[PDB]
Amino acid sequence: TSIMAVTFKDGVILGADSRTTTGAYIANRVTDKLTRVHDKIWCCRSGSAADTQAIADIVQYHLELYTSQYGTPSTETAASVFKELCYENKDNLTAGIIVAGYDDKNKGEVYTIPLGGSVHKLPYAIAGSGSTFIYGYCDKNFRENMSKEETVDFIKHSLSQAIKWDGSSGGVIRMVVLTAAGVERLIFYPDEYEQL
Amino acid sequence: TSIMAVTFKDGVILGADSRTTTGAYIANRVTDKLTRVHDKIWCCRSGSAADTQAIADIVQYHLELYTSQYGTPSTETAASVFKELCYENKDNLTAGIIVAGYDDKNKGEVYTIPLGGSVHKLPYAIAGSGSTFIYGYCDKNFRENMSKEETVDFIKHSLSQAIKWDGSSGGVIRMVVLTAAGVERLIFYPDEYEQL
Amino acid sequence: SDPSSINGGIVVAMTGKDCVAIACDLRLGSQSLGVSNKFEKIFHYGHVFLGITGLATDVTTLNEMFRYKTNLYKLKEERAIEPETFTQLVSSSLYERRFGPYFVGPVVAGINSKSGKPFIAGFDLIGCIDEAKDFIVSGTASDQLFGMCESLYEPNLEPEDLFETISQALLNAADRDALSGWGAVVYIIKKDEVVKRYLKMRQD
Amino acid sequence: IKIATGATTLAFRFQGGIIVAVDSRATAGNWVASQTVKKVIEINPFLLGTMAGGAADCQFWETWLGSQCRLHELREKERISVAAASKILSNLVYQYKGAGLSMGTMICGYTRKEGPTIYYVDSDGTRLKGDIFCVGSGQTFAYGVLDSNYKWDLSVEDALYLGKRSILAAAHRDAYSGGSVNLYHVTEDGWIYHGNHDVGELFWKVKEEEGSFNNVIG
Amino acid sequence: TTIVGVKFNNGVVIAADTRSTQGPIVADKNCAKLHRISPKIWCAGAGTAADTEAVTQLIGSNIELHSLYTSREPRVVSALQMLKQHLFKYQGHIGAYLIVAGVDPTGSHLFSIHAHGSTDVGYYLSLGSGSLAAMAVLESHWKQDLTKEEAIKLASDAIQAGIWNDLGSGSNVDVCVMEIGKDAEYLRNYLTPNVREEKQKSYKFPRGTTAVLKESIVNICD
Amino acid sequence: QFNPYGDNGGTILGIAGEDFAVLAGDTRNITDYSINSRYEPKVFDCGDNIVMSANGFAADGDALVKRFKNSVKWYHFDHNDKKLSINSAARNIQHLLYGKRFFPYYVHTIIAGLDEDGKGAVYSFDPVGSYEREQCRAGGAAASLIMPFLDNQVNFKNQYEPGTNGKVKKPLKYLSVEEVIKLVRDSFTSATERHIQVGDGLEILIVTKDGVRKEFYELKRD
Amino acid sequence: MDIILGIRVQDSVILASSKAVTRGISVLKDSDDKTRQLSPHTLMSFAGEAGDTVQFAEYIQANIQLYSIREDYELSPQAVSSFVRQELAKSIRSRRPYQVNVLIGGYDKKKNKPELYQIDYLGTKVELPYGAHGYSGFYTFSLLDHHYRPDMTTEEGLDLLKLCVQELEKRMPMDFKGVIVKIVDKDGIRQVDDF
Amino acid sequence: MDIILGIRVQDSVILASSKAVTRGISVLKDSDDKTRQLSPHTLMSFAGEAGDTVQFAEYIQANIQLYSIREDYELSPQAVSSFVRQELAKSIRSRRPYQVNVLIGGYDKKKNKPELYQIDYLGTKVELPYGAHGYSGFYTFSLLDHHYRPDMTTEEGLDLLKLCVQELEKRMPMDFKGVIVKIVDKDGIRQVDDF
Amino acid sequence: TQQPIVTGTSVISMKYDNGVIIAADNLGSYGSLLRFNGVERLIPVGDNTVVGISGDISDMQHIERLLKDLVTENAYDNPLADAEEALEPSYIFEYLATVMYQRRSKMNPLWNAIIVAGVQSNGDQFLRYVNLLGVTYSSPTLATGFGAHMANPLLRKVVDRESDIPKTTVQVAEEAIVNAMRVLYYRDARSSRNFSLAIIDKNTGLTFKKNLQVENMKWDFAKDIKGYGTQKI
Ligand SMILES: *[C@@](C)(CO)[C@](*)(O)[C@H](CC(C)C)NC(=O)[C@H](Cc1ccccc1)NC(=O)[C@H](CC(C)C)NC(=O)[C@H](CCc1ccccc1)NC(=O)CN1CCOCC1
Ligand SMILES: *[C@@](C)(CO)[C@](*)(O)[C@H](CC(C)C)NC(=O)[C@H](Cc1ccccc1)NC(=O)[C@H](CC(C)C)NC(=O)[C@H](CCc1ccccc1)NC(=O)CN1CCOCC1
Ligand SMILES: *[C@@](C)(CO)[C@](*)(O)[C@H](CC(C)C)NC(=O)[C@H](Cc1ccccc1)NC(=O)[C@H](CC(C)C)NC(=O)[C@H](CCc1ccccc1)NC(=O)CN1CCOCC1
Ligand SMILES: [Cl-]
Ligand SMILES: [Cl-]
């Protein structure tokens, strides 16, 4: 996997590749790693496909029950539920999750949750095996309060490089845009991003 | 280690950090990883400090004996001697070496020699533990036939990022410039490169 | 220390024209040491026949278990259990011990009393059903039995002919296996009569 | 690969020379590879060797032994002693000790100076002179019949039967022993072969005539 | 095993080979790997044979009770959810690799499930030892907007690739077609391209060949 | 760690008649669950009316055959073009195999031909050089399936004369070349059904005083 | 770890059990009785892991004696052997199994027949004319296979047994310090003091 | 494996060695002589790894006999023991060491004194009044420590030895099939046939 | 005893009526890192043979040097080096197979899988495989690594047996190879889009095609795929 989430002026954008592997075999070349846990709280999944699915399903259940009782949960609240599961079951899980959401008060927020189950709030986050190859690129090119089009290009160029160098990453580049306007899904195919 | 060598208009430039580690302890913070095997054929050393020193010493001996008999050796010839040692003793060595040299006919050339002992001629090369974090950056920013000042900036910015993210890299950035003019040594300190 | 090959033994079952046959060797050993030449591996509950190979303690235990369950079945249902139903019972019972299984290779054989159709089936140690038209094999000489049955078998054999085919399949398979032999028994099963024959074989 | 196979071999000294008796079965795990294996190696017309452990190791080196014995008598103009022949083999395998040879054999012969002689030779270097030896997976079963019925003053006929009956006892109980029985009688003038006997037919024949094996229905 | 699933215009089709192994030995030459969870939800199974049958029957039972309780026809996502949560709980120890497909009031669906509890969505899928051979065919010949007849052809061709090129797969091709608004049609032995040739000789023995020690009539009656 | 051995599957079969001998083998070559070749011969004419096959690890098998063929060539040079008898070839092969006792050829070797009396002869070897002459021998993956069938049909084991109370055995007799080929074909079609590593094709080499003849038959390719 | 033998003859069952108890390089005792009376006409000998053997034998003994008091009736050898088998069959899949092998010699008073049962630690039961556990069978079975007749007397059975012990004393590596012999018949259980 | 004992008395050295040869669960022989005469007044007993024992003993025997012929003179027990020690000392650092333990009993004709040397497979030499190898010492030393006197006769030494063999036969787990006893004195080497 | 470091993935090949085709991608992987992108793994020997190599790249470069030296050695004292006594595919293969088996027998293998494709002097097609174990086999289609699992099934649909070879044209055979390389790019995690392809024909000789790309790929359907089961958005 190569995944990332980036905050910008109008909100936040999640990005991911579409590759799922069993050793060197690609079990799924059109995987959707960007998954909804609430209307405007999404997550990027990396690590075990089984573990990350089971976790995301439980979080979605918790946030649905939260909403019925206490109204719309914060992005911080969603990250806390993820953390609780990842931390308390650290011995039996292999899950690297990035939580991203849009509030009206707090605007775009990004929380990353590595293997151990720690939580880290950041302006942007990268994760997955392919992220290693773009730490330098992302650090040099990230700016706060970017526009939607700038942020889309940043994610596109970043994941393009991650895919190029990482054998465990590839396929299409999926993106999910979270703003006050609503939820927008984007997709970018090899013929476009490879020749960037 | 973080090391690299980059060809440009007037010749080639070698670049390296200055960190030597024993586990997490820094045994030497001012190491010189750029080493001369001939007047205008140098190498970047990564991997085992003992192995790479022993190899470079043998190559320097072979090229000195070559010069006494057959005159100045090519950069390709130097890379071949390195390869021969690394390939035939692959079971007992841990050495990632980049060979760089300046001919008048061939101009600047760069050969990289990974663990297995294979040889790869390239426009530029990166190696060492810290190189992983700048594959994306270097691929996006490298251009052929750069100027001396452009190439120095490229190496400086690249190794700056490699040092920033890699715990096994750090200290000063050493550089060696190989042109028709001669041999020039450069050094860049933390206060400069960190805040790039 | 491989539970399925400590005691040794084999079972084979075949279908014919309006009949079925099931046969087994009589050996029980402790690895190289032969211990008993009277250890029968075929049991019956009403008109349904069950052969069991593998670890002898589990063979004995499972027979006692299926006797238990088929006796209660009959008391509540007021009728004898049929082969198809019994096959499912065996499968359920084995899978109940999925993560601590009985080390066995059971084989069901019988004729449905209502339809008159010949029926055989085989299982693995965790209860996977292997239904077959032709034949089923089990035991330490299963490879040998597969080879004999696949060449010797033909469809719609008469009881007297079927007897010779299954007997020869068992005998020659058992002689190429160290842990099988020491006697043999063959059941020939018709709609309303069952004949049991002991075979003469080499005792080494 | 699998060199560790089962067997029952015996050899004993008596008034009329030496009896050698062996089974014929070879196994690769539970799989019966052969029922017709020759486990007596005819080293020369006067010397016999038994196969137990590695089949190849026994075949190869006891054939090699026959070559050394032929060279001895060409140079010395005299028959080689059983002692000297056995020691050539034991010294040889001792050189290979640790490498992984697998051997348990009885070297049998009858000479003037020695009389009937048996040496147990083994792949870890052991060389033992003795009157009765039994080797293989079924050696214990055969020993029981031998010990209880053995006497020095046995006739040639009765001694041949005893060796045959002892192998049968092992063939019956030991799973890795059986097939057929090969008999040999070693005299001062050379060995005499006393035929191949299928255990299947032999068992039923002995059961009826002897009254033994009542536990078995026949 | 080789198993596949292919979506088409008005529904979905799944297929499977019929070989069952026990080491290098073929235990069953004509076993059924297509399972019915509900009337219009079917499942192709690879991996541990007992586990695929057991897990599919358990979820099928609970799906039936659920359908009766809710007075509704069962949904594929319910079977998917119940299967994956069961498999996840057992941490891969239940070796069931499934292709779940069917039609329900929501529409037509095609999923795969792995032993550890991960699920995937797709228009074409393949599982089992011969999945690479089958996937090679699917990647070569699949297109959008397949008809019923085209999907059956593609699915069976993918299974054939497994039959011929994978030693784990063989014998026949089973198919099940689930079309919207129609009953699901289970096509047992849709193709039989591995018929055994006539033997050179009959091995029927003369009667009395086998030596017999004892005969006795067995009492099966009360 | 590097493992210098592999398993290329396949099975072979040698039968000896009165004035002839056959050495058969399937033409399939495999690694794990993949097919490498559907037609890769492993039964060879080595000269002097000797046919040979070394089944198991194909690299060791080809090396052995190659060394034996070379041994035959030098036997002619050193001994005035004398014909290498089948028994002499057998002893020579023992020394080839045992020469690598501590790093063995991972193969089961079978040779066939005619003895010095003109009678059919088959010799079989274990991986380290123990050998034996036999009327009948199957080797390789499906040996366990084929061999007990041969015992029953060639050597008439467990078959007694009808009506004789199992007292009189069925008498041994030589089979014709036609009857032997029938048994070979039926042996391989049965092994093909139940063993995954056996199939594709069957190549038989028949040896008479006239020379070495070949016959080929198709097998199931699944 | 030792020698327990059993022979069923015409009118009785004879059990022979070694007297040695060894721990390390020391024979701690040379007069150990490796048997328990389960009922007046049923005797059980045992061999296996230290501690487990006696603990198991006495546990069985207690259960059979409890049954006898409750019903005022003696269980048949077949019934006792089945009970013992089931206990071992339970044991083998427990957290810590009983590593005990047993022989059960009994005289059935209803059938007027002697009966010998062999049960290993896995719960593997067989009825036999003669039986053994451990390596003992490897030596004696060929002798019994030969000399054993089904119509033998008790005295003939004792001579056949002596022959077995002699072969064991000759060919076995360990010194097992002789055997205690006990006879089970219609009149109950008694010990042979001079063997 | 097993029992080699040695006792040095006033005027002689007595060596006792077990007769059993065991391989697996079978006693292959019960009359094995675990000793070689190195010279007319020097005897060596041995125990250890199968094959190595005899191969080593005979190799030493050959070397000492070669010396005797060359010099027309018998080497002293002390000289022979030193030679034997050195060979074992070389062996222990070889590719495959001799796993053999020995006792060397000899009568020095120049000193008119009996001498007993104990040498293990490492090349560890000690001169002793009494000695043993393996587990044998664990049983007998306390007996010898008590009953042994330095001025004993040969007959008194044989009785002391009988007492040791009796304790071994009582407490040792394995049956070693008795011992062959040999005496070394001024008149040379002889065997006690009835023990 | 070795472990491979820089590796090359599948090599695929097949026979057609007048010759053979062989292909392999231009990637040198360093574990999961796709480190080197300009690696040629098809190496021509003369004008009638092409050796396709997968596995360890350092060992591949060694074999390149051996083949290059073989051509030099064959030309020594050989007036017919460019005619009757030129190097044949069968000569080149047997040499490599000898070397591979000798190296495995010294427990120091060349960690490669090799396919030698070419046309003999009499016009016969040559196609044979050899690997680190010294194992050799021939078939109308041959492939290494993932190619064995995914390419062979596709290529065997064209040429399923010997009799299908005269019926298969160079246009059809090349189409199947190019299709197979696309499937490998879809499904092999250590593959690249860029590859090389070589045709050895008995009439038109050796045609070596560099810098080919996988094209006409299907990715559009990916946009319709949402979630992993229940998700609708
Ligand atoms: C990139 C690939 C790596 O960062 C991404 O992180 C993606 C994340 C997506 C899918 C959400 N990760 C994967 O694709 C993931 C890689 C992986 C593998 C193993 C452990 C952790 C991560 N792949 C999987 O989870 C696959 C998905 C299947 C094919 C649908 N599952 C496996 O590979 C299973 C997992 C078993 C397991 C191992 C350790 C911890 C948890 C689960 N493994 C196998 O099936 C083993 N396989 C059997 C055949 O022999 C080769 C090995
Ligand atoms: C960066 C750091 C990594 O890519 C660079 O490559 C530099 C290259 C420069 C020095 C030319 N590499 C190192 O600094 C190198 C890291 C390393 C360590 C071990 C194996 C390979 C690479 N460091 C060293 O070589 C140090 C140099 C000493 C401190 C002067 N040596 C060690 O760490 C030694 C090496 C022993 C060794 C192991 C395996 C292969 C070859 C040699 N290791 C130790 O002393 C072990 N140490 C003992 C105390 O307990 C902690 C471990
Ligand atoms: C293709 C054909 C192969 O991958 C398919 O995937 C099919 C799937 C269909 C049948 C649902 N798979 C099999 O046929 C499967 C392959 C297999 C084997 C072993 C483990 C996993 C998968 N075969 C089986 O499941 C057989 C079914 C038999 C033939 C009825 N079962 C066995 O081989 C069992 C394995 C049982 C098991 C227990 C615990 C964990 C995993 C599996 N093995 C035996 O019976 C072997 N042995 C025989 C002697 O008695 C002791 C057990
Ligand atoms: Cl996923
Ligand atoms: Cl340094």
Ligand SMILES: [Mg+2]
């Ligand atoms: Mg990629």
Ligand SMILES: [Mg+2]
């Ligand atoms: Mg048998």
Ligand SMILES: [Mg+2]
């Ligand atoms: Mg037997």
Ligand SMILES: [Mg+2]
């Ligand atoms: Mg097949």
